[PDB]
Amino acid sequence: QEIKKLVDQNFKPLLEKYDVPGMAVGVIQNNKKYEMYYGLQSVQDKKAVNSSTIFELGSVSKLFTATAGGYAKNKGKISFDDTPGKYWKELKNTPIDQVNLLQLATYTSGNLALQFPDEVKTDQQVLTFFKDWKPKNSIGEYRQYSNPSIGLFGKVVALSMNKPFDQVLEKTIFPALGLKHSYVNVPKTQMQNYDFGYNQENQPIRVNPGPLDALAAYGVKSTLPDMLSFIHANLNPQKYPADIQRAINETHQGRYQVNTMYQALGWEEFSYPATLQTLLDSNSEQIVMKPNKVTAISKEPSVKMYHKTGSTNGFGTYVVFIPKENIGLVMLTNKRIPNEERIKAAYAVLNAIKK
Ligand SMILES: *[B]([O])([O])[C]([C]N1[C]=C(C([O])=O)N=N1)[N]C(=O)[C]SC1=NN=C([N])S1
Structure with a gap:
């Protein structure tokens, strides 16, 4: 059916149900990008949410970190066999230097939790944290979804490229993807487009930023048109120059499975058609918050789909293709x-515009 009708039926009611000030929903179909905006970027300013509004992607940031890692790997700048001390020299001869880069990118070091400790903020505190790290579970065998894990991956990628991570994205990866309003650090010239998001009590919220390396886990900001372009790139990588094409495709390869979910770089991958319950189970407390023993991949699904949720204190994100x-x-x-509301509403829309 018409995309607007399906989005109105499935996404629009969520604004009233959850008192969401503004929502941007995009659908890309047959290489045509459709944009739908509901509500306000700023309640106080009566400013409509729009195609220039900048949102925090939360953990959808990890898809950009994955793309950077795929870009570096396919140019020979890193091997997924490497360990972090080859690039971050202060980690040589430490226990974390037994973990390879793929294991860090896919959360299988065996001893890294969801967040850094609150007291870890400066670059020295991050280095000390990784120098003091010791194994718990067998390396490679247990997935524990982890911002420090992919943060160390992103740091190594940046070191291998001789640029800080913000510049890897803003100077190399975002331009190669054709993104015009995607940022690690939003500049003052974009201030009118980037308002605080809203907490559960509808108050504009900010917190002090955490360690710089965690920007690779949750620190990217973007707009709806740019995210639609990023989905286009994932759907149609042959329209893009070869280096970024290889980087995008690298993020689609499953690395192991946990139940019905295959862990790719950044992306979660599923056999397609996937049931709604399979997609919901990927975001269950068991999968997101607890360690789970992985199963090596023998046969990667021939027909696949991919998704990722992201959240920050003030913003929600979901992408699927x-x-x-x-x-x-x-x-x-x-x-x-x-x-669950994000996943269900997207399932209802995409299931009806299949072709
Ligand atoms: B990510 O979005 O998966 C990640 C972990 N996560 C999941 C959820 C959820 O299910 O609501 N919340 N967190 N996101 C982060 O770690 C965000 S950390 C920050 N949030 N706000 C900041 N200013 S930093």
């Missing part, structure tokens, strides 16, 4: 809503 149907969807909000 299905190569066989040549369709994808992006949802951005300036207030968190439950992941």
Whole structure:
């Protein structure tokens, strides 16, 4: 059916249900990008949420970190066999130097939790944290979703490219993807487009930023048109120059499975058609918060789909795409809503515009 009708039926009611100030929903189908905006970027200013509004992607940032890692790997700047001390020399001869880069990128070091400790903020505190790290579970065998893990991966990628991570994205990866308003650090010239998001009590929220390396885990900001372009790049990598094409495709390869979920670089991958329950289970407390023993991949699914949720204190994100149907969807909000609502609403929309 018409995309607007399906988005109105499935996404629009979430604004009233969760008191969300503004939502941007994009659908790409047959290489045509459709944008739908509801509500306000700023409640106080009566400023409509729009195609220039900048949203925090939360953990969808990890898809850009993955793309940077795929870009570096396919240019020979890193091997996924390498360990972090080859690039971050102060980690040589430490226990974390037994973990390879793929294991860090896919959360299988065996002893890294969701967040850095609160007291770890400066670059020295991060280095000391990794120098003091010791193994717990067998390396490679257990997935524990982890911002420090992919943060160390991103730091190594940046070192291998002789640029800080913010510049890896802003000077290399974002331009190669054709993104015009995606940032690690939003400049003052974009201030009118980047308002605080809203906490659960509808108050504009900010916190002090955490360690710089965690920007690779949750620190990217973008707009709906740029996210639609990023989905287009994931659906149609042959339209892009060869180096970024290789980087995008690197992020699609499953590295191991946990139940019905395959862990790719950044992306979560599923056999397609996937049931709603499979997609919901990927965001369950068991998978997101607890360690789970991985299963090596023997047969990667021949027909696949991919998704990722992201959240920050003030913002919600969901992205999903299905190569066989040549369709994808992006949802951005300036207030968190439950992941299950994001996944269900996207499932209802994409299931009806299949072709
Ligand atoms: B990511 O979005 O997966 C990641 C972990 N996570 C999941 C959820 C959820 O399900 O609501 N919340 N966190 N996101 C982060 O670690 C965000 S950390 C920050 N949030 N706000 C900041 N200013 S930093």
